[PDB]
Amino acid sequence: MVGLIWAQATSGVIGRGGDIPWRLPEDQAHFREITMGHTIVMGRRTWDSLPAKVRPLPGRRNVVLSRQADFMASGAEVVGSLEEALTSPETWVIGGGQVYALALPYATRCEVTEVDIGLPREAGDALAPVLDETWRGETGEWRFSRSGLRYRLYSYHRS
Ligand SMILES: NC(=O)c1ccc[n+]([C@@H]2O[C@H](COP(=O)([O-])OP(=O)(O)OC[C@H]3O[C@@H](n4cnc5c(N)ncnc54)[C@H](OP(=O)(O)O)[C@@H]3O)[C@@H](O)[C@H]2O)c1
Ligand SMILES: O=C(O)c1cccc(CSc2cccs2)c1
Ligand SMILES: [Co+2]
């Protein structure tokens, strides 16, 4: 099982300036629940976006995808191809935009948090992957984050 997990604005923006223009504690909790105990695969830029304090993410096989053969990710596994990272029953790809696009053919699940924020796309933004017609989704109920933004969960799946 390869799954993708991300949060996006209604515009599809997932990242800007190397970070994320929101923070939902409820989404972080759902992220930890979904990924705990499994392999997480992330691009080098996303590993850069994690503070040194919190990486590697606890209780998970942290894998970083990089073309730099000498890149050091303390506490993580650095691989040069995505296939190297899929040696486990459950692999969760956790960002960023490049690695989502790279991993989509392998994926049968997308856990998508839609954040009700009006965020026009800018040059340089990281964007969520386009899901074609093979994907079957369950649109969720709008929820209120204590951060003040409304959010909902899409759980997409395909055979
Ligand atoms: N849920 C969310 O909203 C969410 C989740 C995660 C991240 N983000 C955001 O997404 C943004 C970063 O995403 P990104 O698209 O800019 O960069 P990224 O996808 O996180 O990582 C890109 C890097 O991955 C490596 N890479 C990419 N394709 C590769 C391939 N085919 N083979 C080997 N290595 C490859 C390269 O690392 P080298 O350059 O070292 O080779 C490339 O620079 C940040 O703003 C982050 O905060 C958002
Ligand atoms: O654990 C924390 O305290 C913490 C606070 C802020 C941000 C993060 C990164 S989790 C993530 C970011 C992109 C893909 S997965 C972690
Ligand atoms: Co699990």
UniProtKB/Swiss-Prot annotation:
Annotated metabolic or biological route of this protein: Cofactor biosynthesis; tetrahydrofolate biosynthesis; 5,6,7,8-tetrahydrofolate from 7,8-dihydrofolate: step 1/1
Keywords: NADP, One-carbon metabolism, Oxidoreductase
InterPro entries, alphabetized: DHFR (IPR012259), DHFR-like_dom_sf (IPR024072), DHFR_CS (IPR017925), DHFR_dom (IPR001796)
Lineage: Bacteria, Bacillati, Actinomycetota, Actinomycetes, Mycobacteriales
GO BP, sorted A to Z: dihydrofolate metabolic process; folic acid metabolic process; one-carbon metabolic process; tetrahydrofolate biosynthetic process
EC number annotated for this UniProt entry: 1.5.1.3
Pfam families in alphabetical order: DHFR_1 (PF00186)
Gene designation: folA
Source species of the chain: Mycobacterium tuberculosis (strain ATCC 25618 / H37Rv)
The protein's name: Dihydrofolate reductase
Regulation of activity: Inhibited by isoniazid metabolites. The prodrug isoniazid is metabolized to isoniazid-NADP adducts that inhibit the enzyme at subnanomolar concentration.
Ligand binding (NADP(+)): 6-7, 14-19, 43-46, 65-68, 80, 94-99
Coiled coil: none
Keyword Hydrolase set for record: no
